Ligand binder design. Sequence first.
Ligand SMILES: N[C@@H](CCC(=O)O)C(=O)O
Lengths: 32, 132
Amino acid sequence: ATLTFENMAGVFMLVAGGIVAGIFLIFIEIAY
Amino acid sequence: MAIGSLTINEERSEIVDFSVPFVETGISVMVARSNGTVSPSAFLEPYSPAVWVMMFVMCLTVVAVTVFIFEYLTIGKSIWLLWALVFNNSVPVENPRGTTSKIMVLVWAFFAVIFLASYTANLAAFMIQEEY
Ligand SMILES: N[C@@H](CCC(=O)O)C(=O)O
């Protein structure tokens, strides 16, 4: 059994999505 | 008749006759059991060498993101905490007071919780001597 690059895709965009979403909130935070 | 453990052959079947065989017979070799061996597992049989190069990728590009939002409100001190959290966090730490990054690292921190599942459970069975 090998976990491999595949079969773990779901967790990948969570790191990326937080980066994408995070930059949106800081602009509101700076204005706040 | 000579009933018993008689092996049909070529020379014997010349001067006498045989009936229809009812049991197989051949030639085999027997050797005692041998001690098993386990090769040094390459990174303990993880998720291929791709993942090891893979982790270097996002980790090094996500530390820069924190550095960018750090000044807006120390990269050398920003790699000790960000990385070491993934491996059973016990080392001394130094955490910033930036609100924007404070939420960010927690999402990153939660990744380490799920990472252990990859390196636990599976690794238990596949460590004993193999290859026979
Ligand atoms: N019993 C077989 C094999 C030989 C042996 O058992 O010695 C035969 O008669 O040919």
